[PDB]
Design a binder for this molecule. Structure first.
Ligand SMILES: Nc1ncnc2c1ncn2[C@@H]1O[C@H](COP(=O)(O)OP(=O)(O)OP(=O)(O)O)[C@@H](O)[C@H]1O
Ligand SMILES: Nc1ncnc2c1ncn2[C@@H]1O[C@H](COP(=O)(O)OP(=O)(O)OP(=O)(O)O)[C@@H](O)[C@H]1O
Ligand SMILES: [Mg+2]
Ligand SMILES: [Mg+2]
Length: 1211
């Protein structure tokens, strides 16, 4: 293994003490911990093993006729898998809680030792030493293992959810989304970590309630049945809350899915969202979903407030109810009965009225999360391949449907075959079926009739270029061996030579997710170069050529496809008729039908804070929650609860110390004796209980309310800042690193931190309370105790110096999981094309293992601290207790009267306070990561103090003066010394090779990065205007069409600013109307995520429909019809000329026949502008680059273009 792990060879004593972990603190005390410091995950805990285990049981649950008479149960598979490993921890839970019940009895026997006798109480002390050793050192290794039972289940679920995700059919990727799958891997599987802690207390709680009522019936007698009567009410009631926690979690997760789904589309769409200035729309949509989500989080947190309010006060109710129903029958005695009742209920309070109510909420949150995962694991999957002989593709009578019903077939009658040495060109209108035909050969679209046979390994060049976070080399190697001569051949043939020469830092350039840091036709050639490097047998080329320049397109077709691939099997989706002459067969599709098939001759980064969670971060978490007056009120309410609680301890003592009195001069004489005012004593004692109950309930709701409200405002600010972040931020930070904050950390601020903060706070006040009376009682003990406080703060800081780093490593090392997930979810058809699924699983497991290394340290370091605390405290408290046997009554005789009592459970409460005090500061690491993206670098303001005139671009004049541009402050100049004037209403063509900076003119115009020189729009500097006044008033069609899941209305007109009649008008003028009319809901048809329901050419047509609606005077048309077929494009060009005749129009296109009817052509060559003249004034100069580029289009094409250039010039 890469790294050791001392747990594999730790001696058992070093294991129970976690003493083997001590060397980690030696470095964490001195350094920020590093991922290379974290110990390797143990071999049995590997993500590969855990997932392959539980998938075995889940396979045996769906299969083997375990479906014969039932639906599958993922819970039965989980139980069958883990029951033996978990029931063996139940036996320790039985011994543990037996020891808790034994402790007060035998210490009570020491209180009964009171009077000394030979060699007697040393038996009880020997039981107390054995008991406290269980409670204080063995408990922690037990607790570590019940936590690892949850980690193992969590990691097993994560593996098999991703194993499923790779297999999901396109029928199923409509029923699920990246938002759900990220939510499964982040919230729903996270429940499993906490569930297995409490799960044994579903039985150890109720069983221990029955044990104490039996023991008190042997002590108090029948009145102990009133204590049990409370539990016989309370525990069935809290069992019914499980039904509400299940319901409320299922509702919450449905809104968390929708939030993460929308957030994913914001983060991926952010550049186009910015250019449209739709940021206000997504701000409202996310804040609506967050309100709906946080409502059910708030309600379920209020039930959790009742549970924790029952923990505080129900024991005091029990000791009230069992005593009021006793003094109405008998007499309260100093120490004696009341000491035994208080200590028995005090020892058992935790399990019956904290861990049991917690267990039934935690498990009811599990079972819904299991149903969420089970309903994912039962989704549809892709069937395995439909030969050692002749390699071929063969398709026969094939018909298939993307949508199972209510539709015409996507493909019908397909009957083609293609052998090595042939290229099949598939051709036809937008949406005709060309990419669906590749999806048929690729097996992503299953046949409903006919058959497909594929004898060879495929390389798929998808129509949208998939590119993943890595180096440009890694994108081309795709895990294949590096081999210099093969690599140089493909980068030459794919024209990535020169591009890898023209700066980029060369090859090995780091590329952001989705290939965002590349031009559209450059990532398209990386996407082609990957396939050619794989040296496959069958090449499925989904039009790689429409993405690239005319010269580069000829270069690719000759030196790559014809040279390298023409000996392979090739199917080429294309629109470039100039290449169809070279295809061995051509196939034309209309509406999925094979129209004709034949021959052309016959057809015609270590972002982790260094140290403490500063006081400012706590202040921000609280001031995000409520105004300070509410926290002053909360402090008063918190102390009012605790004072009322501890006054019941004192009042029973005071009552007992006055019912024990000497004035019983004759007991049979009745009121001749000073019989106690039972109505007065029960009056005040009842009052103190209702104070304890009501202030306990009130503080629990108030803490949850303000901390849930804090999670609301910290989300809101973190989303606004990210939305207003510059595009550079999204190029730099992986999608999964951002979604980690919105999924996991916000999930922690919603559910887990508000609970653990209250749990700490109310434990702190109890410790503060009892210690204070433990300084009124045996006041000398403060002198022994003062060094204990010093040791605890020293041990806390020494621990926290390491624990905070471990928790930052833990939270950080999770973000690769979600960025790899989202990258591979986009890549699925390509991953499944190469059959790289086993490789992508191996990568994903490597991310789980790296996170498991940090979680293993998180669990273990917590237990190192908790052992060191509990050993020191047990030694302290047992010395105080054992001192009674060396007559510590000589230090204070009050030790005999006011029994040691609650100090026996101070050996627990003091520990849980200091232990959970550190847990809260570990949980506050998630607050820092949310605060971090609140405080990120802002983009320039959306509106300045200056604003334009209300009709500002009255003439669409644009002037660039000396301007140069770079995408990052140290980056290369992607544009250099631009100087051009665009006249009013001037239709300007922008042309030049892939990479030449022409789409960076848009980044300068929309100021997505600051240009380094002046740009004037109608005599206003774009640098002296707010970004929404700038961006709203220029229409854009971007190079890559992005669509949002939502209605067609929501995709055309997010603000409802236009009538649906105008939307039908826009759809008619892109001639997409006939398509939308065929869809069952028309305007109300739901887009699948990223628009996947539409063909890529139709995704472009909705982007024109958007720009037609905006009606601005300035339009910027970035390659908008690249994927549109020529016969549909020529009708769109006609409509662009007619619709936007008054506009200025920066038409950026490689299709020069769209450009040639233009007033001026900008030709830019390496970011430098070098030609700006009428098209014919360039073409008549045969030295011009525009002449060369038109010449590269071919002989008759250049003649036709030169002719129509003359026609537009002679006017
Ligand atoms: N993943 C999908 N799920 C459902 N329907 C789809 C999917 N991909 C395409 N379609 C539908 O199939 C029909 C289109 O097909 P295809 O996507 O096969 O066309 P194309 O040949 O790729 O066209 P273009 O390249 O011009 O976009 C379209 O009308 C589209 O609605
Ligand atoms: N977000 C970015 N961050 C850094 N560099 C970028 C970014 N987008 C593009 N580039 C770089 O800027 C230069 C590319 O430009 P642009 O993207 O302006 O070219 P294009 O003319 O639009 O190309 P194509 O015809 O391939 O679409 C390329 O060499 C690319 O590496
Ligand atoms: Mg571009
Ligand atoms: Mg297509």
């Amino acid at each position: 293994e890469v790294k050791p792990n001392p747990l594999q060879d730790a001696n058992l004593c070093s294991r129970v003490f976690f003493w083997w972990l001590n060397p980690l603190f030696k470095i964490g005390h001195k350094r920020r911990l590093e991922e290379d410091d974290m110990y390797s995950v143990l071999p049995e805990d590997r993500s590969q093993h855990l997932g392959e285990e539980l998938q075995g049981f889940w396979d045996k649950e769906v299969l083997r006729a375990e479906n014969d008479a039932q639906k599958p149960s993922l819970t039965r598979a989980i139980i069958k898998c883990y029951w033996k490993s978990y029931l063996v921890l139940g036996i320790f839970t039985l011994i543990e809680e037996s020891a808790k019940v034994i402790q007060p009895i035998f210490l009570g026997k020491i209180i009964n030792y009171f009077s000394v006798a030979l060699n007697t109480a040393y038996a009880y002390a020997t039981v107390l030493t054995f008991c406290t050793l269980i409670l204080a050192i063995l408990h922690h290794l037990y607790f570590y293992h019940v936590q690892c039972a949850g980690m193992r289940l969590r990691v097993a679920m994560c593996h098999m959810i991703y194993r499923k995700a790779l297999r999901l059919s396109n029928m199923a990727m409509g029923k699920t989304t990246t938002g759900q799958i990220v939510n499964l891997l982040s919230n729903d599987v996270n429940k499993f970590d906490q569930v297995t802690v409490f799960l044994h207390f579903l039985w150890a709680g109720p069983l221990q309630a029955i044990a104490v009522t039996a023991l008190l019936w042997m002590e108090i007698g029948i009145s102990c049945l009133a204590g049990m009567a409370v539990l016989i009410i309370l525990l069935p009631l809290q069992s019914c809350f499980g039904k509400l926690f299940s319901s409320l979690r299922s509702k919450t997760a449905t809104f968390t899915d929708a939030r993460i789904r929308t957030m994913n589309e914001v983060i991926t769409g952010i550049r186009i969202i910015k250019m449209y200035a739709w940021e206000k729309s997504f701000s409202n949509l996310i804040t609506n979903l967050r309100k709906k989500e946080i409502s059910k989080i708030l309600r379920s947190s209020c039930l959790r407030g009742m549970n924790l309010a029952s923990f505080f006060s129900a024991s005091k109710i029990i000791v009230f109810v069992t005593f009021t129903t006793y003094v109405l029958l008998g007499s309260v005695i100093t120490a004696s009965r009341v000491f035994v009742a208080v200590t028995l209920y005090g020892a058992v309070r935790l399990t019956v009225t904290l861990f049991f109510p917690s267990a039934i909420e935690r498990v009811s949150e599990a079972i819904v999360s299991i149903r969420r995962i089970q309903t994912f694991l039962l989704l549809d999957e892709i069937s395995q391949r439909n030969s050692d002989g002749k390699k071929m593709v063969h398709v026969q009578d094939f018909t298939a449907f993307w949508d199972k019903a209510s539709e015409t077939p996507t493909l019908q009658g397909l009957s083609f075959t293609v052998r090595p040495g042939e290229l099949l060109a598939v051709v036809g209108p937008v949406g005709a079926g060309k990419s669906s035909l590749l999806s048929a050969v690729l097996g992503e679209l299953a046949p409903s009739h006919g058959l497909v046979s594929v004898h060879g390994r495929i390389a798929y060049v998808s129509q949208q270029p998939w590119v993943f976070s890595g180096t440009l080399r890694s994108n081309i190697l795709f895990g294949k061996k590096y081999e210099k001569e093969r690599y140089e051949k493909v980068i030459k043939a794919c024209a990535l030579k020169k591009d890898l020469q023209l700066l980029e830092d060369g090859d090995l350039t780091v590329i952001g997710d989705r290939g965002t840091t590349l031009s559209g036709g450059q990532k398209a050639r990386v996407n082609l170069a990957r396939a050619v490097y794989q040296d496959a047998d069958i090449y499925l080329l989904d039009d790689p050529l429409s993405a690239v320049d005319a010269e580069v397109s000829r270069h690719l077709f000759e030196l790559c496809i014809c040279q390298i691939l023409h000996e392979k099997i090739t199917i080429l989706v294309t629109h470039q008729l100039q290449y169809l002459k070279a295809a061995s067969q051509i196939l034309i599709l209309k509406d999925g039908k094979m129209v004709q098939k034949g021959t052309y001759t016959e057809f015609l980064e270590e972002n982790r804070s260094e140290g403490k969670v500063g006081f400012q971060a706590y202040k921000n978490y609280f001031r995000a929650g409520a105004h300070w007056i509410v926290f002053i009120f909360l402090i008063l309410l918190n102390t009012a609860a605790q004072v009322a609680y501890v006054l019941q301890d004192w009042w029973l003592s005071y009552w007992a110390n006055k019912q024990s009195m000497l004035n019983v001069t004759v007991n049979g004489g009745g009121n001749v004796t000073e019989k106690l005012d039972l109505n007065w004593y029960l009056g005040i004692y009842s009052g103190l209980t209702v104070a304890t109950v009501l202030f306990g309930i009130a503080r629990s709701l108030l803490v949850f309310y303000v901390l849930v409200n804090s999670s609301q405002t910290l989300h809101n600010k973190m989303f606004e800042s990210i939305l207003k972040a510059p595009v550079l931020f999204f190029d730099r930070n992986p999608i999964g690193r951002i979604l980690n904050r919105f999924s996991k950390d916000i999930g922690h601020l919603d559910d887990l931190l508000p609970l653990t903060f209250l749990d700490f706070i109310q434990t702190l006040l109890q410790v503060v309370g009892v210690v204070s009376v433990a300084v009124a009682v045996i006041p000398w003990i403060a002198i022994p105790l003062v060094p204990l406080g010093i040791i605890f703060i020293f041990l806390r800081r020494y621990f926290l110096e390491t624990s905070r780093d471990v928790k930052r490593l833990e939270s950080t090392t999770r973000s690769p999981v979600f960025s790899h997930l989202s990258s591979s979810l986009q890549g699925l058809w390509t991953i499944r094309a190469y059959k790289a699924e086993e490789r992508c699983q191996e990568l994903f497991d490597a991310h789980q293992d790296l996170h498991s290394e940090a979680w293993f340290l998180f669990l273990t370091t917590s237990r190192w601290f908790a052992v060191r605390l509990d050993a020191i405290c047990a030694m302290f408290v047992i010395i105080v207790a054992f001192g009674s046997l060396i007559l510590a009554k000589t230090l204070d005789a009050g030790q005999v009267g006011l029994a040691l009592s609650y100090a026996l459970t101070l050996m627990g409460m003091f520990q849980w306070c200091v232990r959970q005090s550190a847990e809260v500061e570990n949980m506050m690491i998630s607050v820092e990561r949310v605060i971090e993206y609140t405080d990120l670098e802002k983009e320039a303001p959306w509106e300045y103090q200056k604003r334009p005139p209300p009709a500002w671009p009255h003439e669409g004049v644009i002037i660039f003066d000396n301007v140069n541009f770079m995408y990052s402050p140290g980056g290369p100049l992607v544009l250099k010394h631009l100087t051009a004037l665009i006249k009013s209403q001037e239709k300007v063509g922008i042309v030049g090779r892939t990479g030449a900076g022409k789409s960076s003119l848009i980044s300068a115009l929309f100021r997505l990065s600051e240009p380094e020189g002046k740009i004037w729009i109608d005599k206003i500097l774009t640098t002296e205007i707010g970004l929404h006044d700038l961006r709203k008033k220029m229409s854009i069609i971007p190079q890559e069409p992005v669509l949002f899941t939502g209605t067609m209305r929501k995709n055309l007109d997010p603000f409802n600013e236009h009538t649906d009649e105008e939307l039908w008008n826009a759809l008619q003028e892109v001639q997409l109307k006939e398509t939308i009319e065929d869809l069952p809901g028309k305007m109300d048809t739901e887009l699948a995520e990223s628009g996947s329901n539409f063909s890529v050419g139709q995704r472009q047509l909705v982007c024109l429909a958007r720009a037609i609606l905006r009606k601005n005077q300035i339009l910027i048309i970035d390659q908008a019809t690249a994927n549109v077929d020529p016969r549909t494009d020529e009708l769109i060009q006609k409509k662009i000329r007619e619709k936007f005749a008054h506009c200025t129009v920066l038409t950026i296109a490689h299709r020069l026949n769209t450009i040639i009817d233009s007033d001026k052509i900008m030709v830019l060559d390496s970011g430098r502008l070098k030609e700006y003249d009428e098209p014919y004034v360039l073409l008549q100069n045969k030295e011009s680059l525009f002449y060369k580029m038109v010449q590269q289009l071919g002989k008759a094409e250049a003649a036709a273009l030169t002719e129509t250039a003359k026609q537009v010039y002679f006017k």
